[PDB]
Design a protein around this ligand. Structure first.
Ligand SMILES: Nc1nc2c(ncn2[C@@H]2O[C@H](COP(=O)(O)OP(=O)(O)CP(=O)(O)O)[C@@H](O)[C@H]2O)c(=O)[nH]1
Lengths: 205, 496, 82, 85
RNA sequence: CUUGCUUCUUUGCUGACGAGUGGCGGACGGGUGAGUAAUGUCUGGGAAACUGCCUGAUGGAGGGGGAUAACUACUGGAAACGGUAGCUAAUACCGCAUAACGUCGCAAGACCAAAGAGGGGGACCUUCGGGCCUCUUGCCAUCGGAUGUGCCCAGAUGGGAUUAGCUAGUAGGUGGGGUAACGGCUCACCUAGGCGACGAUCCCUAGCUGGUCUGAGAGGAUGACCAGCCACACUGGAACUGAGACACGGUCCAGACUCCUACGGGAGGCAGCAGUGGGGAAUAUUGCACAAUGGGCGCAAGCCUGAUGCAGCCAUGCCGCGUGUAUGAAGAAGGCCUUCGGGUUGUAAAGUACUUUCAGCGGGGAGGAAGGGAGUAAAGUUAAUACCUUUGCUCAUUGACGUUACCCGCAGAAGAAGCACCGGCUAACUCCGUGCCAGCAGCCGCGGUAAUACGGAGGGUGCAAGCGUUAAUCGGAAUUACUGGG
């Protein structure tokens, strides 16, 4: 299910920083970004329409860590909702529990947040959840149980939370590690760079 | 004085072992008469007998055969020997005594074929006591030589019986004369022949010993018995000796200690997987050692070597050879169960004692010719049904990698058993034989990890799957086995 | 003979009974006249545990429907003064 | 088939004479009245109808006749005997 | 002989209970779609009907008789399985009395039935068999309600015209018989009608439907699992019991196939659950229990249930989780390429610091459990504080799953990642080896000594406990055009 491989090769493959190597350290410049995705990375591709559709889809997926059948299920869930499909798809991607744990700063990277959810530490509404694909309902409160609270791995990785944008749609206590979920995020708030329209183009055919 | 142990004492074991062409089948068919109930099968007769219930267990008697009896003489406490006078003490009997001296079984012998010519009795007893180095104590001796054998004269019973001819079909009784020095017996038999018989009985009293009870258990002085198997006479006196001489069924050795016949945790492990006759099903067999513990109908056995709680409620009893209904019994009997490719030979059973016995005799056979699949449609009956026969002690099927030319394993010579067994409900391929040379002992070996992997790597075209997913190596010559020993396969060795 | 009885719907290790009026010769999950109410035995204390319309049940009592033991226990659960 | 519930077979054998024999004598009485229809004697027809009426009503009572067959017999036979008379 | 300690023959006198008579169920539950093109199914109406078990109302339930099994004595057969001669009971059978809004009839008139059992007891009466009083339950007759079933009509429900005539109980009518009931359903007579180009008769195929898949919709294939109906129970025919069968685990006869025989004759029908042979590419365990539901019987307790509730196997389909995370440049070793400068594999691996989902082990531990049994109290019932119904209340409790879901603790990254593709369609590049050969390929198409196509290596791409191929349906295909072509 999980990739567990070259998480920094994917950032060179898409060119943009996928935040898979976020970590305690800052922007690395230790892998020759944008100029070497692989062995023949010096070639300039033709980069057609289906090409940029597939690159955009795999970019959003390796940001969010969602497999293809699971993302197609998210697209099928977002297609039957109201409004428009592109906002609803990214809202369902943000509604994952491990993404909420990542936005709270409870872990440096996304795989660390998925491991923290999976190892019976993340608890929402007094009920412990192991599945990282937990659809977070609005008006919930997420925290860490007392038997797994602050064994230093949440601690220094919380300092990275002092360097992030700290978005509006969720609030962390940062004294007892008790987060608070709020209303759904607007499209003009989440990372301002990814394109949902190419994903709609790919899953429309 | 509980009746449980009192009928533990009423369960005894005599299988039968003998020479080829000795008369196992005739004497078992005639003991079927005595309770109101060549050679390719095994059969178990429980009995409807009056006094006790003493089981039988047949076996094919040859040198290429009888790998059954190397592991089912371990099952049986006692021993019946059948020796002909024309055959005498031969290499078959020496091999069977090499088997029976290892466990000290009580032995009662039965000289057969009293219709044909038989040598002098003292010469035969000296042949036994010389070529076996084991003494004996005779009780009777019949009349004269040739066809003149018409009587039996007991010593420790003092009973004189006569014989009538042509009684092989019906059960008939001959009248009884009590006295030993009766002149009317001399008139009915013949005076000079009876005087020669009395002189031979005096030579018995002057040149032999008496009977023992504590040394009978070890089997030092093994008693003999006389009579024919066809004349319906000589085996009728065997039953009293079967009642009076044979003890309780002995404890058997485990890895910890001997388990007695008064305990629990049923020790019924499988001895033979028999050459199965197939009406519609296999069931494979389960001949067992349930000497310890009285059965239950809804008992749940425990497979020790796989350590699983297996619910087995169906158990066949061998009443007069026919596989009878679902019946529980008294301990000291041999069952038959319903398995589907799960239980091999020697798989132990307890209710929690996770230990093993000291059995598992019979390893390896010469390599005969092949399977080449005449009428090549529906190969699956030999890809299953002979691999079904591969769990037996006689047949171990070898699968080479090239997916043709599958070797039938035989430890004996006569593979006509499998050829006749290829004409059953789930057996329809012929596979007529020829001459193909594959030499000897595909010596089975499965080494420890990280070291047999390179051994699979270097000569990957020189392996062969076995019955039970084994890979011995491949045996075409002795020089290849010398190269295999030179290759140094350090192994946690199990022979299989 | 008509009767009011449970139907045993739901998933494996997740029972969900259907109290229903049906003929006795029909199957459990078979043909029925009409359904009235339901019962969930694994329903812990929450917003809804058991719905049961007593008007149609009284109508079938007025017609001659034999009430089983579980349906009579549900009638004694839905008590007129409690 | 070997079954403990074979008793309903031979007991139905115990039925298939006796009840049917009653049906037998029933219909012969009916046929007797038809003889009167072939006779033309209205008094004998009335006597035969009065002879057959209580036994056919008893056979309608004992479950053999379903009280509409015997009603049909009484109906059309009464119609014949008062059309003749 | 420890004289009330133990041994022990009779004894239905009790609790109960093989076999037998009888009542009910066996027509439900379960399996398959062989047959069937309308005798079937669906949609919608209708009368000339039935309806045990459920229930409402109104009455009766009186008085007698004869057989029989089981049981005895003899006897036939190997068995299966009886026969002869006696005895006995019933809620089994059969008369007699008696009826009404019931049946027939225009009416007068005629006819039609049963069965009693179990619990408790005051007075009286006991030939001491018990009547008698009360309660519960069962029976008969009628009117009904509901349920299910039977019957009729219209429409709809595949192809073939290289199937154009079909029909003689055929079409209608009268009369008799028959069906719970209309009915050529069946017989006697009379006439020549009846169907049909808006497909009659014949052939092939097919269970039908709600539904499933696909499709924006209209449509197309399918209808396997869930559910309703129909048909079938090795093949065909036939009746009986029973309210309901012209009958899966009922009967007989005729035929095919296995088995026994003492050869006189019998037993059998897995298109039940399991399991086997054969077929085929292809499909499971000869498992646990009535713990819960439902069905059958019984007042009830209790009994059966291969339906069911589960357990085992199969990645067959869907879903989720993990196989680590953070840091870590000498940008190490090895592989590949090279313009031999260097790049790639590659934060990948090694090292360091944490963590352990799921597996292994050791302990707690719900819920699926309602009921039912014993005892007590109160209210009904009745002469009755006795019996019985109902409701609180006290006690002992009822789990195959189950070494349960779930929770806690131990240890160690420790046990857990593969499959296809890389010329275009369509996501991704080189090197080496042959050389229109070996070979690949869904289409266009490559390989003829510089192959981004074959094989191998490196790298990348895509999907993920699944990945490719094959087989089928729909869309794209407005290339069957009614929407929507000439
Ligand atoms: N007349 C006579 N013939 C006998 C007697 N015993 C055996 N036979 C004959 O000897 C032969 C032995 O036959 P069988 O019973 O099959 O021998 P077996 O001992 O079973 C053979 P194996 O040892 O291989 O199991 C037969 O031909 C049989 O008729 C006997 O007492 N009398």
């Amino acid at each position: 299910a999980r990739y567990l491989g070259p998480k920094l090769k994917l950032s060179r493959r898409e060119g943009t920083d996928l935040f898979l190597k976020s970590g305690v350290r800052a922007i690395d410049t230790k892998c020759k970004i944008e100029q070497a995705p692989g062995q023949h990375g010096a070639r300039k591709p033709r980069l057609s329409d289906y090409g940029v559709q597939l690159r955009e889809k795999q970019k959003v997926r390796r940001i969010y860590g969602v497999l293809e059948r699971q993302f197609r299920n998210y697209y099928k869930e977002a297609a039957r909702l109201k409004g428009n499909t592109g906002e609803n798809l990214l809202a369902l991607l943000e509604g994952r529990l491990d993404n909420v744990v990542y936005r709270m700063g409870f872990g440096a990277t996304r795989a660390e947040a998925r491991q923290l959810v999976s190892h019976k530490a993340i608890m929402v509404n007094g009920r412990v959840v192991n599945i990282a694909s937990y659809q977070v309902s609005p008006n919930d409160v997420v925290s860490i149980r007392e038997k797994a609270k602050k064994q230093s791995r949440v601690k220094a990785a919380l300092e990275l939370a002092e360097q992030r944008e700290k978005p509006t749609w969720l609030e962390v206590d940062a004294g007892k590690m008790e987060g608070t979920f709020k209303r759904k995020p607007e499209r003009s708030d989440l990372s301002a760079d990814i394109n949902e329209h190419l994903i709609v183009e790919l899953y429309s055919k | 004085l509980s009746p449980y142990l009192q009928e533990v004492a009423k369960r005894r074991t005599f299988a039968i072992i003998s020479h080829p062409d000795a008369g196992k089948t005739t004497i078992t068919e005639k003991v079927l008469l005595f309770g109101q109930a060549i050679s390719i099968t095994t059969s178990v007769m429980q009995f409807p007998y009056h006094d006790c219930l003493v089981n039988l267990l047949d076996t094919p008697g040859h040198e290429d055969f009888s790998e059954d009896t190397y592991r089912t003489l371990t099952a049986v406490d006692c021993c019946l020997m059948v020796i002909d006078a024309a055959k005498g003490v031969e290499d078959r009997t020496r091999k069977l005594m090499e088997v029976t001296r290892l466990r000290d079984t009580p032995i009662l012998t039965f000289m057969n074929k009293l219709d044909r010519d038989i040598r002098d009795p003292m010469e035969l007893l000296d042949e036994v006591e010389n070529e076996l180095k084991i003494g004996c104590a005779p009780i009777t001796w019949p009349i004269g030589c040739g066809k003149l054998f018409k009587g039996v004269y007991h010593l420790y019973k003092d009973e004189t019986y006569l014989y009538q001819s042509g009684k092989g079909h019906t059960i008939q009784e001959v009248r009884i004369v009590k006295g030993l020095n009766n002149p009317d017996l001399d008139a009915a038999v013949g005076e000079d022949l009876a005087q020669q018989l009395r002189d031979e009985l005096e030579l018995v009293k002057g040149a032999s010993n008496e009977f023992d009870k504590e040394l009978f258990l070890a089997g030092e002085i093994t008693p003999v018995f006389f009579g024919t198997a066809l004349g319906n006479f000589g085996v009728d006196h065997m039953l009293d000796g079967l009642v009076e001489w044979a003890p309780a069924p002995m404890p058997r050795q485990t890895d910890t200690r001997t388990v007695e016949a008064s305990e629990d945790k049923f020790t019924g492990f499988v001895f033979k997987i028999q050459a199965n006759m197939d009406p519609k099903h296999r069931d494979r067999v389960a001949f067992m050692r349930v000497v310890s513990g009285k059965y239950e109908k809804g008992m749940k056995l425990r497979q020790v070597r796989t350590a699983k709680d297996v619910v087995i409620s169906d158990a066949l009893t061998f009443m007069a050879g026919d596989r009878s209904h679902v019946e529980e019994a008294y301990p000291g009997d041999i069952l038959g169960l319903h398995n589907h490719g799960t239980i091999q030979i020697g798989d132990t059973f307890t209710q929690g004692e996770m230990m093993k016995f000291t059995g598992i005799p019979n390893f390896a056979p010469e390599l005969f010719r092949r399977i080449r699949l005449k009428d090549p449609l529906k190969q699956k009956q030999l890809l299953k049904g002979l691999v079904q026969l591969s769990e037996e002690g006689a047949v171990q099927v070898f699968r080479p990698i090239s997916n043709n030319d599958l070797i039938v394993g035989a430890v004996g010579v006569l593979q006509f058993d499998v050829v006749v067994a290829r004409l059953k409900s789930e057996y329809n391929v012929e596979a007529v034989y020829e001459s193909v040379n594959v030499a000897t002992a595909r010596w089975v070996e499965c080494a420890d990890a990280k070291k047999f992997e390179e051994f699979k790597r270097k000569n990957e075209s020189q392996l062969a799957l076995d019955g039970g997913d084994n890979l011995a190596y491949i045996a075409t010559s002795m020089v290849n086995l010398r190269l295999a020993q030179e290759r140094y396969p350090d192994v946690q060795f199990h022979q299989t | 003979m008509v009767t009011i009885r449970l139907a045993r719907h739901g998933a494996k290790k997740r029972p969900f009974y259907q109290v229903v009026v049906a003929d006795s010769r029909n199957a459990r999950n078979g043909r029925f006249i009409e359904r009235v109410g339901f019962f969930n035995p694994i329903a812990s204390e929450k917003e809804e545990g058991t719905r049961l319309d007593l008007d149609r049940i009284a109508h079938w009592v007025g017609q001659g429907a034999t009430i089983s033991d579980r349906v009579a226990a549900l009638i004694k659960e839905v008590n007129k003064a409690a | 088939n070997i079954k403990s519930a074979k008793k309903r077979a031979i007991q139905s054998e115990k039925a298939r004479k006796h009840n049917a024999s009653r049906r037998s004598m029933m219909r012969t009485f009916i046929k007797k009245v038809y003889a009167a229809i072939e006779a033309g004697d209205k008094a004998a027809a009335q006597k035969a109808f009065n002879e057959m009426q209580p036994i056919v009503d008893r056979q309608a009572a004992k479950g053999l006749i379903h009280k509409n067959k015997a009603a049909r017999h009484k109906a059309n036979l009464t119609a014949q005997i008062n059309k003749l008379a």
